[PDB]
């Protein structure tokens, strides 16, 4: 017998619609997110569940579900929030065309929570961010209202799973209003692929 | 001495003026990295300096120490060069970036130093382009300026004595067309990140 080592790593994606960086954006739907899965000597690509944790006309918050097998575990999560966009209809693959910024509000951060069948204890949660210089200008918009470029976090906790269960990770808010839209302006609504950030989840079994 | 890791972002101070001016590179450089020993999470400096220089560009190099033994080395290089102002009020707020050249000769690489044998070198370089019409501080990406130059590198090192290898970086471009910082009237110092480098050593 041996203590199991599990990890997930990957970059969830969201397809959005944006016209001119004057107007709001329209968020696509969240669903399966391709991740790399590691369990001891096993490795493969799996899909994790994502959906909206909350949604309003202003913003929407994403959450990502992670399976905890039966057992006791210490979890370490590394998140790097950055939301660069690229045009879906761009003839070339993946040429970045700007990004969506974050609110500087104190309630905006990466967090975790319990889903079916799991007890979270020992939550330690360090959130950091990168700010734009006020006179920074991306596609003719500035950063004078303190919009943020990045929101990162490193989280650790213990988790007891009496049975096979799930916890969820909450991302920072996806801002819908034009204040935070730094995408290239287009004539009519144009699909863009938005990155939601690099997430690394590690689970060490304790026995 | 079974597991050793370095992870950090080397810094370089630059000076930049207007958008039609070159940038001027500072000196390299001790670079503070996070240092990892199996279960220990400490900090260390590594040695960086210039592999080459010309009027157009400069290539940086970083030395990583390799204890005596036989090691699996995997390196993730995430090349991105955002800039921030060096002086308050806006230290550490992003004020632009320095883009890369699309030339085929510009890429992350490693080399041997001090009686040390690198074998089974696998080096995979990638890049990310900007949409031509993407605009940063009134400057576009219409000459195939690259935002990102990345590399995954794996190899084996045989270290009979304590030694080191060196990681050579993509070239730092000095000319105006790669300068996407906020313009000023006087030469204004910026701190430039040189990329996130993750170096892991596994003893065998």
């Amino acid at each position: 017998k041996h203590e199991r080592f599990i990890a997930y790593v990957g970059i969830p994606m969201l397809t959005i619609q944006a016209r001119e960086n004057d107007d709001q954006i329209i968020l696509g739907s969240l669903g399966s997110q391709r991740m790399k899965y590691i369990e001891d000597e096993n490795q493969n690509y799996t899909n994790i569940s994502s959906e909206y944790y909350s949604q309003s006309s202003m913003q929407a918050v994403p959450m990502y579900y992670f399976n905890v097998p039966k057992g006791q575990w210490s979890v370490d999560i590394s998140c790097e929030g950055y939301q660069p966009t690229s045009s879906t209809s761009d003839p070339h693959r993946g040429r970045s065309d700007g990004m969506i910024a974050y609110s500087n509000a104190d309630s905006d951060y990466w967090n975790v929570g319990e889903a079916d069948g799991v007890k979270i204890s020992k939550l330690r949660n360090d959130n950091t961010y990168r700010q734009g210089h006020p006179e920074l200008e991306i596609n003719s918009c500035h950063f004078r209202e303190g919009q943020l470029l990045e929101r990162d976090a490193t989280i650790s906790f213990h988790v007891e799973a009496p049975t096979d269960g799930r916890f969820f990770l909450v991302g920072p808010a996806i801002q819908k209003t034009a204040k935070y839209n730094y995408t290239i302006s287009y004539g009519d609504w144009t699909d863009r692929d938005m990155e939601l950030g690099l997430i690394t989840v590690v689970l060490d079994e304790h026995l | 001495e079974r597991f050793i890791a370095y992870v950090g972002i080397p810094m370089l101070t630059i000076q930049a003026r207007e958008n039609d001016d070159q940038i001027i590179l500072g000196s390299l450089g001790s670079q503070r990295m996070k240092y990892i020993e199996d279960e220990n999470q400490n900090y260390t400096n590594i040695s960086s300096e210039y592999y080459s220089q010309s009027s157009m560009q400069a290539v940086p190099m970083y030395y990583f120490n390799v204890p005596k033994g036989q090691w699996s080395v995997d390196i993730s290089c995430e090349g991105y060069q955002p800039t921030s102002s060096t002086s308050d009020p806006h230290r550490g707020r992003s004020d632009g970036m320095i883009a890369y050249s699309n030339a085929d000769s510009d890429y992350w690489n490693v080399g041997e130093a001090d009686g040390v044998k690198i074998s089974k070198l696998r080096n995979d370089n990638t890049y990310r382009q900007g949409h031509p019409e993407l605009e940063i501080n009134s400057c576009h990406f219409r000459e195939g300026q690259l935002l990102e130059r990345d590399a995954t590198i794996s190899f084996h090192v045989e270290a009979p004595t304590d030694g080191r290898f060196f990681l050579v970086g993509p070239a730092i471009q000095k000319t105006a067309k790669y300068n996407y910082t906020i313009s000023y009237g006087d030469w204004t110092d910026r701190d430039m990140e040189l990329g996130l480098i993750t170096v892991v050593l596994d003893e065998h």
Binding site: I11, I38, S78 | V7, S76, Y107, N125, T198
Partner: peptide, 17 residues
């Protein structure tokens, strides 16, 4: 930082030299 190898970043077209 971790024992997990970071993945190739998104929308990176691969350099075949």
């Amino acid at each position: 930082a971790n024992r997990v190898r970071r993945p190739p970043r998104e929308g990176h077209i691969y350099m075949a030299s």
